[PDB]
Amino acid sequence: EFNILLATDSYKVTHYKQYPPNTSKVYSYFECREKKKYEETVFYGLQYILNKYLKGKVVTKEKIQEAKDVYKEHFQDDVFNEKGWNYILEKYDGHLPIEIKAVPEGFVIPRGNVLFTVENTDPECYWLTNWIETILVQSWYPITVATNSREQKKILAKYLLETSGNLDGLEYKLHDFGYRGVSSQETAGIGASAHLVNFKGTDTVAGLALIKKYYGTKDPVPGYSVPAAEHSTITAWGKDHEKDAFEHIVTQFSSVPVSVVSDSYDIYNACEKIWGEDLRHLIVSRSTQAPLIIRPDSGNPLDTVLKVLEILGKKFPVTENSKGYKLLPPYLRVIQGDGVDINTLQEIVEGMKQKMWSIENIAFGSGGGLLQKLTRDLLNCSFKCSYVVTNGLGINVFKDPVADPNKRSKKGRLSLHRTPAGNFVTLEEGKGDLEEYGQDLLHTVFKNGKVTKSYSFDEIRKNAQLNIELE
Amino acid sequence: EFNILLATDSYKVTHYKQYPPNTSKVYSYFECREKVKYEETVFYGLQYILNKYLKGKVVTKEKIQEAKDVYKEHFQDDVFNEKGWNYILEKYDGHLPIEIKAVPEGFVIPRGNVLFTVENTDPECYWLTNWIETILVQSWYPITVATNSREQKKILAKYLLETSGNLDGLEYKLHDFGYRGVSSQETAGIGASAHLVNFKGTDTVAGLALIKKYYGTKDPVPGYSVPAAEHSTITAWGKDHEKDAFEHIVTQFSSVPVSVVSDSYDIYNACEKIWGEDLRHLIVSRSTQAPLIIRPDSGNPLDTVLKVLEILGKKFPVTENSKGYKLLPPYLRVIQGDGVDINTLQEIVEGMKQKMWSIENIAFGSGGGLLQKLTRDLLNCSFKCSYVVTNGLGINVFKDPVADPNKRSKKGRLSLHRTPAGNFVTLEEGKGDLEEYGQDLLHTVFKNGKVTKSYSFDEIRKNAQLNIELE
């Protein structure tokens, strides 16, 4: 079972002995710190952590004893704050005396702004605010997946609009292939849910149950997929029977969309001779609601996509759309799901544009690039103490390392506001109390063991919309 | 609750319909596919997956109904194999009719070798082998963390041996700081445990319980830490009271090791004037068993380490060890825990060596670098079908994409052997049965719902030792 007393960085066990004596309040905040790309971030994922790990009776006698036993051996010393944890158990029935205020989930906020704050609500628990730093900071992951996914949606929207004149199908242009490529089952669910803030296509099934349990949608599910082959279902037929595999699969799935990986032996032969000649009659007969989606899966991504389109364009009837770009017939599409990250995505769509191919023709799958190849450094997600009260006096505190001004932190009590021009600003040093900038955009989402404000997945999706979608 | 029917890539739900008719066996294997770095891998983490997710009754009537209901919405159609899953429920009381063979955990094996194989044990469940691809392929993560951690240990060993003449303390030279920097609590535990295959220092407490539950150690715990400050326990004292904070902290922890982050405002001032003058009397009085460990945390990692050492060397009595390298007195050490990955680690120890500083003086902390900044591409961890039986006939199968020879997969039934020179070789096409290469080194680790062979964490550590440790 999960034990919050064992869910912190080891050294934090020792911090209750290190704060100034007579400290009654420790107040800390989280930001995606500005660095001297990724100018704005999607705030998403805190509600998951609040519900799964922080709410309700999270302290018990048994959990306190288990932590005491572990830390005795881990430190080879008795340094654990048993008294402090006992107090929470006795006084609050094991509920955390903490208040967390946060910007609404889905909100899109420029770098360098307060996203949430944490403070103790009982003077005895001054040490608790930063105990939970470690678990709260893991919100960096859904924030970063959601943000990077959104930035890819911006690229797709730009190129789809330019080559087609509209945004039809945008929400299915980047499919999550990352289940096998992430570090754990839990990460899979969290990451997939973050991608679904921006798109509707996922093969990472774990995301669906997470959204249903912690957020909720009006629709039965937040994400969708369609039938498709993998290399094993082609290669199992034997090297000389690739055509037989293709025919069997597209016939099994004749009335729904189906994707067929086509590079087991020779992608170019498969497109030109197998699909383009031998089995063409099974392709040209398909419904617009049930295309074949050809999937290359190796070679230089841009070079391969362009060559595949070039081949298909000569075996199938291509049209020129009203923007002047080439368009495959509606029963035939392509998905590139190898080597796709934000950089290569951009390279591929720009390459297609240069060769006069509409982005209507293609969709992308991304796995490791979408869900695993991300770190806390990308957006400088960071949690810092900005305000303490000692001997009844509040003091504004901060770090400001001489050799790195980028690591300077904010001072005092913080609040988030709209500017007169409709942008965002974080006020420091309690200046929000002057009420010169309208209402604080941070809302209490957690207090004394209870989740106090929640958002549905639908609301989050609404908040995270692109400007171009809004327009 | 976890549901194995919902723990696969969506498209695999549709694969049972795509294999050749009358296929009775699907046999697949995992390797770290061959491409100058990472020539050998540490096999670790499958035992966790087998126990947490695959063993025992993993199919229930309720789980089948849940999956059916989810997939109907996710695919907007009825494509889920209810019959196949009901078969497993009724015939085997929901135990998976699968056999997995694997190399022992902790084993260090060159790239491009079979590490584990999977096949179904009931002809009706031919589809099951690749259903569990997704969950098994997540073994990439503990393998990759353990491997990259071990590669860092090789660097540290080389330089510690050169500069000091021995390997004392090697096992505490790379400390895990990665708890906040990984993508989930589950990942935290898995990754921390993988690092502990090589070292004993961790702040990622989640790793301890995972090891205790799934592997086991003779010792009470597999990993250790010591008291230490964070920026908040320094900055909370106020900007003008950094000295007061330092004095309080080292006095509270006067007889155990303590690390104190010293760069809140000016690391060089902190080292030269606060530690080196104002509080020097509190440092030179400490026990060899209780050093102060000074922690810089910003600036260029190499330049900052070198400058910190130069400052301390002029304020404290430095000796020259038997190798001719400079050594701080035993009550004083440094830890660099900012910007550390395998590359910067190498740069720092080489720079220290060039400046005649012993590696005895320093330890490293690594967070995102150690546990998060890794992907499945680093070692090319991959699962592929190599052998099928259809119409009673076994066929060797494989992919071999024309544009990427590096993605070619192995053919037929596989086995792992010792060569005459004592190295590893993987035999394909069932050739292990020719008995020209002695016994198969893989062991059956899972069969029909039961874990059939397992390893303690102590044995895994022994298997993963460096050659230099063995010498």
Ligand SMILES: O=C(NCc1ccc(S(=O)(=O)c2ccccc2)cc1)c1cc2cnccc2[nH]1
């Ligand atoms: O083909 C796969 N999944 C099915 C699949 C999803 C989306 C698409 S699409 O073109 O975006 C699309 C979306 C919506 C409606 C129609 C078409 C095609 C097919 C798969 C490969 C793979 C590789 N690695 C890991 C996991 C994977 N899933």
Ligand SMILES: O=C(NCc1ccc(S(=O)(=O)c2ccccc2)cc1)c1cc2cnccc2[nH]1
């Ligand atoms: O200081 C920290 N932990 C305690 C800490 C562990 C090991 C060391 S050591 O020098 O390797 C050492 C090991 C064994 C015996 C003596 C000395 C020093 C101090 C910390 C910073 C941080 C930053 N980010 C995240 C999480 C962190 N923990």
